[PDB]
Design a protein around this ligand. Structure first.
Ligand code: GTP
Ligand code: MG
Lengths: 168, 71
């Protein structure tokens, strides 16, 4: 009965941080233990219902493997939302989110919503970045922030709900 | 090479919009899919969406093959 709008979300981050696993958990309420790297870019979608609005979330799931890197600016430009993912056990993946976010702004400027995601919170014994450092980095780059575990499902639904509530 | 890149970019842009609009149309019909006729249209649009997504993947492989040449 409500108006329906589409919004495209691009998932960005170093290889193996869990971009696809977050999507698989949201789309299929499942988790795959065996790593299957994304070859190029994949498309998935889901409808979300909100008070007085319906949104069709369209997801560009991009590869972290370096050979596909030059294909990614096209999908950033195509998207109004960027989900930049790192791995809380992997300091380099966190540092690189500054580069990912800078590339988003190269393609979109301020005309974009950015969610920084620290994934794999279930690997608590191997954590290399505190939740505080992630929260402060996001505030410094003026982006949203959340920590998740695609493996346990922790905060995965909240990630997409918070993004959907931020849309126009 | 810069010229080939402009050509491939424009073709991909057409394809991304077609995928997104095909998917948007699926989402619209799914809202009120309370009929045998509606799910049949939904099934057909889903076939068309998969076909477009498959074209994009193949265009992507072609794009990387043509970038790996000498200019
Ligand atoms: N413990 C734990 N492992 C995870 C989690 N998320 C992903 N993994 C594992 O990490 C590996 C990489 O996951 P992917 O979802 O394929 O990562 P990706 O970012 O999509 O990787 P690329 O597409 O190659 O860029 C897989 O083995 C997953 O099972 C998580 O939340 N917790
Ligand atoms: Mg992936």
């Amino acid at each position: 009965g409500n108006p329906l709008r589409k919004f495209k979300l691009v998932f960005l981050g170093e290889q193996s941080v869990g971009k696809t696993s977050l999507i698989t958990r949201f789309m299929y309420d499942s988790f795959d233990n065996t790593y299957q790297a994304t070859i190029g870019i994949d498309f998935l979608s889901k409808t979300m219902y909100l008070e007085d609005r319906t949104v069709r979330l369209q997801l560009w799931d991009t590869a972290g493997l370096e050979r596909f890197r030059s294909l990614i600016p096209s999908y950033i430009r195509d998207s109004t939302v960027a989900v930049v993912v790192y791995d809380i056990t992997n300091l380099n993946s966190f540092q690189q989110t500054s580069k990912w976010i800078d590339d988003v702004r190269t393609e979109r400027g301020s005309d974009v919503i950015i969610m920084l995601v620290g994934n794999k919170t279930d690997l608590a014994d191997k954590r290399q970045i505190t939740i505080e450092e992630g929260e402060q980095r996001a505030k410094e780059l003026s982006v949203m922030f959340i920590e998740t575990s695609a493996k346990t499902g922790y905060n995965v639904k909240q990630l997409f709900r918070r993004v959907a509530s931020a849309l126009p | 090479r810069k010229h080939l890149e402009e050509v491939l970019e424009m073709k991909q842009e057409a394809l991304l919009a077609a995928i997104s609009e095909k998917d948007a149309n699926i989402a619209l019909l799914e809202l009120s899919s309370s009929k045998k006729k509606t799910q049949e249209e939904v099934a057909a649009l889903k076939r068309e969406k998969d076909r477009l997504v498959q074209q994009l993947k193949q265009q992507t492989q072609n794009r990387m093959k043509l970038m790996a040449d000498n200019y």
